[PDB]
Amino acid sequence: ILSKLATNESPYFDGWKAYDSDPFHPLKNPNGVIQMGLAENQLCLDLIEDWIKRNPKGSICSSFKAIANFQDYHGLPEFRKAIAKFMEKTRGGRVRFDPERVVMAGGATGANETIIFCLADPGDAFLVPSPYYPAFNRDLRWRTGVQLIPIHCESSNNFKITSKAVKEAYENAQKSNIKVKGLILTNPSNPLGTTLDKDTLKSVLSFTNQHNIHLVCDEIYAATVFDTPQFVSIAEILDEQEMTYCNKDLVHIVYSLSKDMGLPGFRVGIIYSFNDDVVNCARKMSSFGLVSTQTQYFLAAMLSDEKFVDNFLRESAMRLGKRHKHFTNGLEVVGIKCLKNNAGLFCWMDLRPLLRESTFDSEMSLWRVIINDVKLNVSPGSSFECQEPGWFRVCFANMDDGTVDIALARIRRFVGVEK
Amino acid sequence: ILSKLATNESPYFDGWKAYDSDPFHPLKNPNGVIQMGLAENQLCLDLIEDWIKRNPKGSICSSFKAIANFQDYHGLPEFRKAIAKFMEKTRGGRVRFDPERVVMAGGATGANETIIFCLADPGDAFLVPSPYYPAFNRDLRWRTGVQLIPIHCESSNNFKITSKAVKEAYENAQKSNIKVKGLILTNPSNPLGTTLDKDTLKSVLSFTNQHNIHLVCDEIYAATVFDTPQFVSIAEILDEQEMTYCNKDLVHIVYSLSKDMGLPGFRVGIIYSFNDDVVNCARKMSSFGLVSTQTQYFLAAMLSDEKFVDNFLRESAMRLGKRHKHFTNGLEVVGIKCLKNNAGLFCWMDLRPLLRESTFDSEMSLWRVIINDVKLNVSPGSSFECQEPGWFRVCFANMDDGTVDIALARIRRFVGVEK
Ligand SMILES: *Cc1c(COP(=O)(O)O)cnc(C)c1O
Ligand SMILES: *Cc1c(COP(=O)(O)O)cnc(C)c1O
């Protein structure tokens, strides 16, 4: 006699399974499936590996007893500070983050779930532009009892958020007598890999503020921007003249080191709320997903080395851009267009012309050819609740140059032999 | 407009505050408050510190990329295995643990909360003997909407669980039309520091099984036993002849390394369920509180060193016992009796004769003298929902010999100057 949650728990996992089954390897499995579905950042690990060698004092008492026995939920004082500065830094030191507000959580997964707990009761709702990070359906609803309402986005205006589409989704929900507690954005965007425009942000923070609902911003890809415009954080939107009168009790940021540092395995999630009560409730809830002191120690060390941090953010961006363009260009050879983007660890590719029809059935049909016959594991627009068929997210930050070129040839091959 | 949880959130923290304010230190603050309220294990850290030095390969790629990028929620294969054996070992290898069942969680705090999510819906109930680990009131209810029903325990039969008291609490709840989904024990016991008797366990697993409700066992102090009888794990109760027919879907274990290894800061919580569905649901929920891969690596290394593990469990028990007896004896000099115990990092001291009356008001009165005038931070029975005044939990595993002797003198002093 389990609980509802237990007693109530795989079609979009076909790609992921096809790979695990026949995993590509240059020598061992050369005709294997190339992983292009997971958003990992590895074009920089050599930068982190390096740092670790020349600095044999950023771990295991380089004070072992202290970090091992330390169990306060504000975490190590120096850990907070290094996280707050790493954040100011990512937004070009154009804003200040008070580390006394920095709260921990089980990576961004626990961050997003915890914040929802703080802003909505079972049954309440949250608005969210589509396409969006699929795990949201779990992270934001499963144990929170909170439901998600989609704000529709299409290819015409390149998938931008419009006051029309927002009030559309918003008002619509009201008819059904649904209580909307807030709106959650992802900026830079996932799966679009696009940094939201400054005015666009303003419009949304306006709508949000004009209806006293929250604006949760998951800026986890903040340090993956590799091309203009420059990333405008919500923290910056608030320090602006015309936005001075917005209620900071409605604004919150959700961060993590899993994507712009390539450390998803360290489970470093952060919640930076402009609301003191939320900061409180959020911290008390962090004792369910506190970052390991052992890991807090190591990061306080590495993130305190300005020289390293400045080099990384710069060096890393240079590679991501290099990689991205190299991939985009290859695709435009065989005539494949992508959604122009300047961030993320992937690109929003358009295969609408390869669809036999403009139906999801076709999208799923084509996708099967890619995971089985072209042997590349990629994600289909439907996985992200994209409301228009034909789009695929393709990740390019988890492999080396040679592999990126094999995939390109494979795509070049498949396309040629199709017209 | 926050959520109910946020918009709804300190008298028992007087002791904790008195210490932070005037913290004892041999030279700096010699007349300071001695910390005897926190259940930390440090009589062994030298054993762990040591191991780390002679083994400079149990951390940060001694394979950094791999552990850093690793994000599967079954965790590192070798991490599970070393945790499963460390567990078999703690129960005298008298039982076997299949590491394929080992699920992670945010320390025991996230373990206990996650399991409740899996076994009870908002409004359901759980039975729990009193006194109990105070954080339960948060860990088990706060975000689960599940309520706790106390099974009364008194000093007569030395605070044992009786079928009478259990069916008492159980049936009583039914009248009030409350749905009871299970019963959660702590063995060894907190704050009693007593390992439950073999037959006693059987009786409870019987009542539980005879009413198809769950039996969650938080055996977090399993490796702190320092005196007979020997710790009987619930895993062992199940491998017994007369218990062969009990439903394993109702039995679950909750573990952590925070108390018997002194690593509360590494947030290593485990859930070992004999129920395959719970194991599933529990794992999917672990992605909210996964142990850091960086920490999984280090533990897979140290816990794989049998020689070390055998020495530790043995060495550690020897010190805990040494310390405990030395403390108990001192107390019996001035005539202070404690509840006989063979585990934990504290002792259940009886100050009933010092109470001016048999009321909690008196208990709180006396407690004030101890935290302010005798300057020792200790926990009062009421903090643990003890239903009878006069008992105090006093922790003795977080300081050295000299400090343990100062406290004893302080208590000797206070007692003398009181009769
Ligand atoms: C990858 C991702 C996450 C996961 O963050 P973790 O730290 O790994 O938990 C959350 N949100 C978005 C939008 C992501 O892309
Ligand atoms: C100390 C304690 C906990 C906390 O375990 P953590 O790993 O620190 O989260 C849970 N339950 C009991 C009974 C405890 O004594």
Ligand SMILES: NCCOCC[C@H](N)C(=O)O
């Ligand atoms: N979508 C389920 C959660 O897994 C985390 C996301 C992962 N980084 C990915 O991009 O698939």
Ligand SMILES: NCCOCC[C@H](N)C(=O)O
């Ligand atoms: N009681 C609140 C949770 O803190 C954890 C428990 C701690 N180890 C203690 O013994 O006080």
